[PDB]
């Protein structure tokens, strides 16, 4: 159904391709040309996961594991039950993610708003793309992608992390992790200010932007503002996604030794006395 104010926004137009052939809503969801392709790719990918789960012998969501082919297969196609199903699901997943981002473009174009959200999602797609196709392409085998399992893909992260003997020493991991712990820092404080101002102690008037502007001024000596927090906030999270993409694309295609060994440039600088 609609909302109390949704009717005036459900106007014709704003599509990128397909026009009014697909321009309709199914329930609350907007269906476009890319909503059709999202439905096809997401359903095909989801079904193939359960088809692979059926032949794997278990339907347990924790134990479901669609793994990539062996490194011997290289960049070619593998038998569907020897890692080939993972390749098709990856194609379906990439097609579903791109369609989802392009569907968001149609939605925000129909609403006359900025394309920040589809761009921000594209960074998440890029982080997935650099994990499943870009890094395997550079390393010469599709078997370097993570498997499609709830807990099976954690073993890939653990093994790939220890494939460089201490993965915390990755300089791009440090930058990326610093962005996650700070993005959650910014989310906690930004969500707190609006809630604190809009929900004062009972029996007292709500506060405006000035009161929260002067609160962190009184708290930490500086306030970035109502608009600034969303601007730095998108940048903090986008940098978190981007630098996470960087830390894994340099682990193996650009750096093969241990990550602690990378910091040897700093230790043995000529300026440091022996």
Partner 1 sequence: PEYQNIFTQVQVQGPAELGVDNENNLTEERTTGTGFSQLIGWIGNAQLGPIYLGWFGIISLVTGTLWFNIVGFNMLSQVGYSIPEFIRQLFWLALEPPSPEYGLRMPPLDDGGWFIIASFFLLVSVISWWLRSYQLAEMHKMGKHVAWAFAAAIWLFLVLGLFRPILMGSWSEAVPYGIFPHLDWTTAFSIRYGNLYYNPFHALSIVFLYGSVLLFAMHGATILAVTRFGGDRELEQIYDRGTASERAGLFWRWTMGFNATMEGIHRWAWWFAVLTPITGGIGILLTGTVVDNWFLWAVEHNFAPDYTQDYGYEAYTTYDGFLGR
Partner 2 sequence: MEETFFGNFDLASLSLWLFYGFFALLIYYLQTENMREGYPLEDDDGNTAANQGPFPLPKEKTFKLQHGRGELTLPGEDVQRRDNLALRKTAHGNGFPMEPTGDPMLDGVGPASWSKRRDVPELDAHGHPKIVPMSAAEGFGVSAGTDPRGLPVMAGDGEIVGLVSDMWIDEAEQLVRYLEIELDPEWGDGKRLVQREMVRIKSDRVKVRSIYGKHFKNVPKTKSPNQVTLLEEDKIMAYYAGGTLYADESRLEPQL
Minimum distance, C-beta of residue 38 to partner 2, in the bound complex (Å): 17
Helix (H) or strand (E) holding 144, with range, is none
From partner 1, ligand BCL, partner 2, none, interface partner of 215 (C-beta below 5 to 8 A by class): partner 1
Q: Which two tokens stand for residue 55?
A: 């032949």
Would you count residue 13 as binding partner 2 (CB under 8 A)?
yes
47 binds ligand CDL (CB under 6 A): no
User: Residue 177 CB, nearest distance to partner 2 (Å)?
Assistant: 24
> Which one, 112 or 221, has the nearer CB to ligand BCL?
221
Contact predicate 81/73, CB 8 Å = no
Radius of gyration of the chain (CA): 24
Contact yes or no for 72/90 (Cβ under 8 A): no
Give the nearer residue to ligand BCL in terms of CB position, either 78 or 247: 247
Alpha-carbon distance 69 to 142, whole Å?
Answer: 7
Q: Minimum distance between the CB of residue 93 and ligand BPH, rounded to whole angstroms?
A: 4
What residue number has its CB nearest to ligand BPH? 45
Looking at 160, 182, 196, 211, which residue binds ligand BPH (CB under 6 A)? 182
Q: How far apart are CA 183 and CA 177, in angstroms?
A: 10
Q: Which residue in this structure is represented by tokens 């990918």? A: 45
Using the rule CB under 8 A, is 151 a contact of partner 2?
Answer: no
Contact 246, 170 (CB under 8 A): no
What x-and-dash track marks residues 190-229 binding partner 2 by CB under 8 A? --------x-x--xxxxxxxxx-x-----------xxx--
| 153 annotated ligand-binding residue | yes
DSSP 83: I
Query: Can you tell me the distance from the alpha carbon of 101 to that of 94, in angstroms, rounded to the nearest whole number?
Result: 11
Per CB under 8 A, residues contacting partner 2 are 1-20, 23-27, 109-113, 198, 200, 203-211, 213, 225-227
């Amino acid at each position: 159904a609609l909302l109390s104010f949704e009717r005036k926004y459900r106007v014709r137009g704003g599509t990128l391709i397909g026009g009014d052939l697909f321009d309709f809503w199914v329930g609350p969801f907007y269906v476009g040309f890319f909503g059709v392709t999202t439905a096809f790719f997401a359903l095909l990918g989801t079904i193939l996961i359960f088809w692979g789960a059926s032949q794997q012998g278990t339907f347990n969501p924790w134990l479901i594991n669609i793994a990539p082919p062996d490194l011997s297969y290289g960049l070619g196609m593998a038998p569907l039950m020897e890692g080939g199903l993972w390749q098709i699901i990856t194609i379906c997943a990439i097609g579903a993610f791109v369609s989802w981002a392009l569907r968001e473009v149609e939605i925000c174009r129909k609403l006359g708003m900025g394309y920040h959200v589809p761009f921000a999602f594209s960074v998440a797609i890029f982080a997935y793309v650099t994990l499943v196709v870009f890094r395997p392409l550079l390393m010469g085998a599709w078997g370097h992608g993570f498997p499609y399992g709830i807990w099976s893909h954690l073993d890939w992260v653990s093994n790939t992390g220890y494939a460089y003997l201490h993965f915390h020493y990755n300089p791009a991991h440090m930058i990326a992790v610093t962005f996650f712990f700070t993005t959650t820092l910014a989310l906690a404080l930004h969500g707190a200010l609006v809630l604190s101002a809009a929900n004062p102690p009972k029996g007292e008037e709500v506060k405006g932007p000035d009161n929260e502007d002067t609160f962190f001024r009184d708290f930490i000596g500086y306030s970035i503002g109502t608009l600034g927090i969303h601007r730095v906030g998108l940048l903090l999270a986008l940098n978190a996604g981007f630098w996470s993409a960087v830390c894994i694309i340099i682990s193996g295609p650009v750096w093969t030794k241990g990550w602690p060994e990378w910091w040897n440039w700093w230790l043995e600088m000529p300026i440091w006395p022996s």
